[PDB]
Scaffold this motif. Structure first.
Motif, PDB file in Angstrom:
ATOM      1  N   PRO A  80       0.799  -1.283  -0.080  1.00  0.00           N
ATOM      2  CA  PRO A  80       0.134  -0.116   0.129  1.00  0.00           C
ATOM      3  C   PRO A  80       0.785   1.348   0.124  1.00  0.00           C
ATOM      4  N   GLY A  81       2.321   1.032  -0.077  1.00  0.00           N
ATOM      5  CA  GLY A  81       3.155   2.154   0.212  1.00  0.00           C
ATOM      6  C   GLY A  81       3.929   2.321  -0.909  1.00  0.00           C
ATOM      7  N   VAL A  82       4.652   3.579  -1.245  1.00  0.00           N
ATOM      8  CA  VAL A  82       5.508   3.726  -2.220  1.00  0.00           C
ATOM      9  C   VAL A  82       6.727   4.333  -1.714  1.00  0.00           C
ATOM     10  N   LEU A  83       7.866   3.880  -2.513  1.00  0.00           N
ATOM     11  CA  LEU A  83       9.333   4.163  -2.116  1.00  0.00           C
ATOM     12  C   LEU A  83       9.840   4.845  -3.186  1.00  0.00           C
ATOM     13  N   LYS A  84      10.368   6.283  -3.013  1.00  0.00           N
ATOM     14  CA  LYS A  84      10.660   7.098  -3.961  1.00  0.00           C
ATOM     15  C   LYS A  84      12.250   7.276  -3.808  1.00  0.00           C
ATOM     16  N   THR A  85      12.799   6.985  -4.855  1.00  0.00           N
ATOM     17  CA  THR A  85      14.604   7.077  -4.759  1.00  0.00           C
ATOM     18  C   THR A  85      14.832   8.290  -5.463  1.00  0.00           C
ATOM     19  N   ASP A  86      15.535   9.077  -5.071  1.00  0.00           N
ATOM     20  CA  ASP A  86      16.046  10.509  -5.596  1.00  0.00           C
ATOM     21  C   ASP A  86      17.607  10.237  -5.679  1.00  0.00           C
ATOM     22  N   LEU A  87      18.207  10.515  -6.741  1.00  0.00           N
ATOM     23  CA  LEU A  87      19.872  10.441  -6.888  1.00  0.00           C
ATOM     24  C   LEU A  87      20.276  11.633  -7.706  1.00  0.00           C
ATOM     25  N   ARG A  88      21.332  12.173  -7.398  1.00  0.00           N
ATOM     26  CA  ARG A  88      21.902  13.391  -7.813  1.00  0.00           C
ATOM     27  C   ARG A  88      23.370  13.264  -7.658  1.00  0.00           C
ATOM     28  N   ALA A  89      23.941  13.846  -9.146  1.00  0.00           N
ATOM     29  CA  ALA A  89      25.464  14.089  -8.933  1.00  0.00           C
ATOM     30  C   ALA A  89      25.724  15.311  -9.942  1.00  0.00           C
ATOM     31  N   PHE A  90      26.599  16.127  -9.198  1.00  0.00           N
ATOM     32  CA  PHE A  90      26.919  17.332  -9.777  1.00  0.00           C
ATOM     33  C   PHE A  90      28.327  17.223  -9.925  1.00  0.00           C
ATOM     34  N   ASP A  91      29.047  17.786 -11.009  1.00  0.00           N
ATOM     35  CA  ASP A  91      30.288  17.783 -11.420  1.00  0.00           C
ATOM     36  C   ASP A  91      30.899  19.324 -11.660  1.00  0.00           C
ATOM     37  N   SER A  92      31.530  20.114 -10.782  1.00  0.00           N
ATOM     38  CA  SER A  92      31.557  21.448 -10.864  1.00  0.00           C
ATOM     39  C   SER A  92      33.105  21.893 -11.174  1.00  0.00           C
ATOM     40  N   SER A  93      33.433  22.437 -12.168  1.00  0.00           N
ATOM     41  CA  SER A  93      34.751  22.699 -12.270  1.00  0.00           C
ATOM     42  C   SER A  93      34.626  24.190 -13.010  1.00  0.00           C
ATOM     43  N   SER A  94      36.037  24.817 -13.047  1.00  0.00           N
ATOM     44  CA  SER A  94      36.361  26.084 -13.576  1.00  0.00           C
ATOM     45  C   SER A  94      36.295  26.368 -15.005  1.00  0.00           C
ATOM     46  N   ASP A  95      35.752  27.739 -15.229  1.00  0.00           N
ATOM     47  CA  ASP A  95      35.424  28.211 -16.734  1.00  0.00           C
ATOM     48  C   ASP A  95      36.163  29.441 -16.870  1.00  0.00           C
ATOM     49  N   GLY A  96      37.003  29.519 -17.792  1.00  0.00           N
ATOM     50  CA  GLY A  96      37.430  31.114 -18.239  1.00  0.00           C
ATOM     51  C   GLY A  96      38.435  31.668 -17.150  1.00  0.00           C
ATOM     52  N   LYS A  97      37.866  32.804 -16.411  1.00  0.00           N
ATOM     53  CA  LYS A  97      39.016  33.573 -15.601  1.00  0.00           C
ATOM     54  C   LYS A  97      39.012  32.893 -14.285  1.00  0.00           C
ATOM     55  N   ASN A  98      37.957  32.250 -13.683  1.00  0.00           N
ATOM     56  CA  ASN A  98      38.295  31.366 -12.517  1.00  0.00           C
ATOM     57  C   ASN A  98      39.143  30.236 -12.489  1.00  0.00           C
ATOM     58  N   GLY A  99      39.217  29.897 -13.855  1.00  0.00           N
ATOM     59  CA  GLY A  99      40.303  28.627 -14.114  1.00  0.00           C
ATOM     60  C   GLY A  99      41.723  29.176 -14.191  1.00  0.00           C
ATOM     61  N   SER A 100      42.106  30.501 -14.234  1.00  0.00           N
ATOM     62  CA  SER A 100      43.205  31.056 -14.318  1.00  0.00           C
ATOM     63  C   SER A 100      43.713  31.675 -13.191  1.00  0.00           C
ATOM     64  N   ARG A 101      45.053  31.671 -12.730  1.00  0.00           N
ATOM     65  CA  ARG A 101      45.649  32.350 -11.552  1.00  0.00           C
ATOM     66  C   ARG A 101      45.216  33.861 -11.774  1.00  0.00           C
ATOM     67  N   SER A 102      45.268  34.830 -12.701  1.00  0.00           N
ATOM     68  CA  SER A 102      45.235  35.910 -12.780  1.00  0.00           C
ATOM     69  C   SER A 102      43.787  36.237 -12.813  1.00  0.00           C
ATOM     70  N   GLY A 103      43.040  35.496 -13.243  1.00  0.00           N
ATOM     71  CA  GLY A 103      41.513  35.669 -13.075  1.00  0.00           C
ATOM     72  C   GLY A 103      41.145  35.534 -11.864  1.00  0.00           C
ATOM     73  N   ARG A 104      41.521  34.750 -11.177  1.00  0.00           N
ATOM     74  CA  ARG A 104      41.266  34.546  -9.755  1.00  0.00           C
ATOM     75  C   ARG A 104      41.638  35.657  -8.848  1.00  0.00           C
ATOM     76  N   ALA A 105      42.945  36.245  -9.234  1.00  0.00           N
ATOM     77  CA  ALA A 105      43.559  37.325  -8.737  1.00  0.00           C
ATOM     78  C   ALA A 105      42.729  38.614  -8.812  1.00  0.00           C
ATOM     79  N   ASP A 106      42.179  38.553 -10.031  1.00  0.00           N
ATOM     80  CA  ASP A 106      40.950  39.880 -10.096  1.00  0.00           C
ATOM     81  C   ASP A 106      39.751  39.594  -9.660  1.00  0.00           C
ATOM     82  N   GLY A 107      39.473  38.728  -8.882  1.00  0.00           N
ATOM     83  CA  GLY A 107      38.336  38.364  -8.070  1.00  0.00           C
ATOM     84  C   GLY A 107      37.309  37.462  -8.718  1.00  0.00           C
TER      85      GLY A 107
END
Length: 399
Positions: free
Chosen positions: A209-236
């Motif tokens: 009489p019951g329902v089991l709901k399964t919720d799975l999530r996977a995120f991969d986040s990595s740098s792009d552009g300025k954030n991926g460079s030393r000088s970019g991070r230096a500028d904020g």
């Protein structure tokens, strides 16, 4: 079918009260008016239309914008127009957008909702898929009338050091495998900050009489552009996280994984979940700061906290009851407790916890049918904040 015949409107009335206790006592109260208009489409293979979203808030620092004074304004309003075109089941929208996707969803935790500006195509013409791709340029906060460029925690707010970006690209889809199973893949890219991939699964399993709901999530986040460079991070172009030696801003670098299981029977819902964040950066998501509101698509995005910090592992338990099964339709109770640890900090590993409750009653019938009352309470302790919301809401047809 046609522009006129298929036109619809809508008015939502929202009375919103919030009080917060910090260890500051703060209190805000407003009446909100949310008027949506949605035209139909002109005739022809390619139809054209226009939508409008009118927002007004009247005061009765996260609900209302401030005067040049520093005091909360008396009222604030905005109008968001969206041009649209459609062929078959594929729609293009240009202007005001309010996505609810794993890589971007608008916040609506206060009086008036967040909106974004951009262009977007969605389609259900490919069988069993719901597909989307778009580009966002600006967002208007819940407590603002102005569109501003996009940012993330660590680079956001309004200081001189803050940095932002006016290009966010996104794409993905939901695939319905069958009645019980849906898969998802989404991609998000805030230019000069990050690229983010998401996989998801939702499965519903009939067990007696019951329902089991399964919720799975996977995120991969990595740098792009300025954030991926030393000088970019230096500028904020940086994200909050923990990078050793007391450094709390740096390169995007986060992997998030979660499993949430909810079993529902006889009105009761009971859930248990776990989320693991690895990498040096917090989990990244669009977030202007300045109280404008933000939503992360994490199982831990709750009333106060988001448990989104670098290194953090979080377990949670959920309980809910729908009183319809017992004779009080429209009354529901929910609660969740979350406990996070291994938060990486300059002080070593840290922990935090939150307990939320939500009690809501929506009048099921009669003349006030649809009138809803909601109490949300949260207690948050980290390293401390208690919050109450009281919301009365009513939506009515204005065709």
């Amino acid at each position: 079918a046609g522009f006129i015949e298929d036109s619809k409107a809508s008015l939502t009335l929202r009375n919103f009260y919030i009080n917060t206790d910090n260890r500051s006592k703060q209190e805000e109260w407003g009446q909100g008016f949310i008027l949506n208009y949605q035209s139909g489409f002109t005739q022809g293979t390619v139809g054209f239309g226009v939508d409008a979203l009118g927002l007004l808030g009247v005061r009765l620092g996260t609900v209302f914008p401030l005067e040049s004074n520093g005091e909360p304004v008396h009222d604030f309003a905005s109008l968001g127009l969206t041009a649209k075109a459609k062929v078959s089941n594929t729609e293009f929208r240009y202007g005001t957008l309010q996505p609810k996707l794993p890589v971007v969803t608008y916040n609506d935790g206060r009086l008036l909702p967040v909106t974004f500006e951009g262009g977007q195509v969605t389609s259900t013409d490919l069988k069993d898929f719901t597909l989307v791709a778009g580009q966002l340029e600006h967002s208007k906060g819940r407590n603002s009338t102005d569109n501003r460029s996009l940012s993330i925690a660590g680079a956001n707010g309004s200081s001189a050091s803050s940095r932002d970006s006016n290009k966010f690209y996104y794409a993905g889809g939901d695939y319905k495998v069958n009645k019980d199973l849906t898969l998802q893949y989404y991609y998000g890219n805030l230019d000069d900050f990050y690229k983010q991939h998401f996989l998801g699964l939702i499965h519903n399993w009939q067990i007696g009489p019951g329902v089991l709901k399964t919720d799975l999530r996977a995120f991969d986040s990595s740098s792009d552009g300025k954030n991926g460079s030393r000088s970019g991070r230096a500028d904020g172009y940086v994200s909050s996280g923990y990078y050793g030696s007391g450094v709390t801003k740096g390169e995007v670098d986060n992997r998030a994984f979660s499993g949430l299981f909810t079993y529902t029977v006889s009105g009761h819902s009971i859930g248990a979940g776990y989320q693991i964040l690895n990498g040096d950066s917090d989990f990244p998501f669009l977030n202007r700061g300045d109280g404008e509101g933000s939503t992360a698509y994490l199982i831990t995005d709750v009333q106060i906290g988001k448990f989104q910090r670098a290194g953090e592992r979080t377990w949670q338990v959920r309980y809910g009851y729908d009183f319809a099964t017992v004779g009080v339709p429209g009354l529901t109770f929910n609660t969740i407790y979350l406990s996070g640890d291994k938060i990486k900090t300059a002080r070593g590993d840290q922990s935090e916890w939150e307990r939320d409750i939500s009690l809501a009653y929506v009048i099921p019938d009669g003349t006030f049918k649809g009138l809803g009352f909601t109490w949300k309470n949260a207690s948050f302790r980290s390293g401390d904040q208690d919050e109450n919301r009281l919301i009365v809401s009513y939506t009515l047809p204005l065709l």
